[PDB]
């Protein structure tokens, strides 16, 4: 399901992502635009037997388990299909432990490439939340 800006930003506000470590809702919604275009069921394959899952394109190597990736560490202890739900809870929860691993939101290639060092607060400018 392709979410829509403020609908997603309202549910992420709700899920405590606001100012989680030092990242305001501008960043969380920004990543979800440039990682997936807000499509909950978005998948993308990588160069090493791994897929990225959901809104926030969590990699099946380190973070979730899909049972066909090698080097699977599954650090969020979750099936990656749990990450393809139209309700952001398991995605928010694993996002917390990704942003906690001492790297901040750098783990997200598109956040790093399209949302870092810009006016990320733009992403909810005009939004109810």
């Amino acid at each position, epitope marked *: 399901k392709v979410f829509g800006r403020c609908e997603l930003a309202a549910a992420m506000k709700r899920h405590g992502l606001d100012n989680y470590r030092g990242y305001s809702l501008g960043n969380w919604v920004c990543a979800a635009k440039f990682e997936s275009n807000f499509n909950s069921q978005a*998948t993308n*394959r990588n160069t090493d037997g791994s897929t990225d899952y959901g809104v926030l394109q969590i990699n099946s190597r380190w973070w979730c388990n899909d049972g066909k990736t090698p080097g699977s560490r599954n650090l969020c202890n979750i099936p990656c299909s749990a990450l*393809l739900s139209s309700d952001i809870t398991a995605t928010v929860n694993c996002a917390k432990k990704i942003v906690s691993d001492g790297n901040g939101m750098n783990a997200w290639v598109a956040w790093r490439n399209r949302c870092k060092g810009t006016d990320v607060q733009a992403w909810i400018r005009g939004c109810r939340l």
Partner: antibody
Framework: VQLQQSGAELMKPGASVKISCKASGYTFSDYWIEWVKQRPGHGLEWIGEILPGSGSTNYHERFKGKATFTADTSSSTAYMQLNSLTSEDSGVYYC?????????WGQGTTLTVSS | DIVLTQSPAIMSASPGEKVTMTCSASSSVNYMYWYQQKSGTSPKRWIYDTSKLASGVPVRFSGSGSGTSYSLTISSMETEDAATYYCQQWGRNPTFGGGTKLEIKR
């Protein structure tokens, strides 16, 4: 309770066709079913795949737009649709598993596109 | 993505003797997968994740390599090892290799 496919097709150029894969016996919802194409003499080409539960699909560069996947959770069937068939689409299409719990392929559907 | 070239395309061996098939990737790849296809059946996954044999590959097969060169080696060629073997880089967009045909000698 098998990875079963549809019989062989014979189709006019220009039309579309749909191959089933009645993937039965496990929690369908939970595993990716891939699809491969075999042109005898040239061998294998990977089409793409679909995770029944979520409707998520990945397609190879070459088959995006030529192929579409669907899955119907209640009959535990998965289907591939070939758009706009030409002669160079004649081959055997295989559905398969490739995870750490099983890896069975289906037997193939041959498809002849001819007038 | 990567082009996989297999050498040789047809090959022969007697029962009892040692077989090595080679597959070359145009780019570095992280893992290689081998599938075997006998005439008249759908291929079967034979070695996965570069060295792990699939359920039902007899212990006489083993595969290796890294980056550019991988290989499938049979130590005793048994008659039932005659098929085509194919390699696949199962990457962002998977490609298969041409194959190698194994005929038994007489």
């Amino acid at each position: 309770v098998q990875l079963q496919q549809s019989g062989a097709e014979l189709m006019k150029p220009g039309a579309s066709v749909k191959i089933s894969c009645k993937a039965s016996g496990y929690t369908f919802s939970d595993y990716w079913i891939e699809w491969v194409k075999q042109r005898p003499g040239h061998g294998l080409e990977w089409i793409g795949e679909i995770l029944p539960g979520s409707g998520s699909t990945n397609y190879h560069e070459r088959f995006k737009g030529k192929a579409t996947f669907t899955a119907d959770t209640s009959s535990s069937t998965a289907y591939m649709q070939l758009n706009s068939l030409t002669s160079e689409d004649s081959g055997v299409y295989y559905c398969l598993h490739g995870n750490y719990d099983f890896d069975g392929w289906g037997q193939g559907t041959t498809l002849t596109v001819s007038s | 993505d990567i082009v996989l070239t297999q050498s040789p395309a047809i090959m022969s061996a007697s029962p009892g003797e040692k077989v090595t098939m080679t597959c070359s990737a145009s780019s570095s790849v992280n893992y290689m997968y081998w599938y075997q296809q006998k005439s008249g059946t759908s291929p079967k996954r034979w070695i996965y994740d570069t060295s792990k044999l699939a359920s039902g590959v007899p212990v006489r097969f083993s595969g290796s390599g890294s980056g550019t060169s991988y290989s499938l080696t049979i130590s005793s060629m048994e008659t039932e090892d005659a098929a085509t073997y194919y390699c696949q880089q199962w990457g962002r967009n998977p490609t298969f290799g041409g194959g190698t045909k194994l005929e038994i000698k007489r």
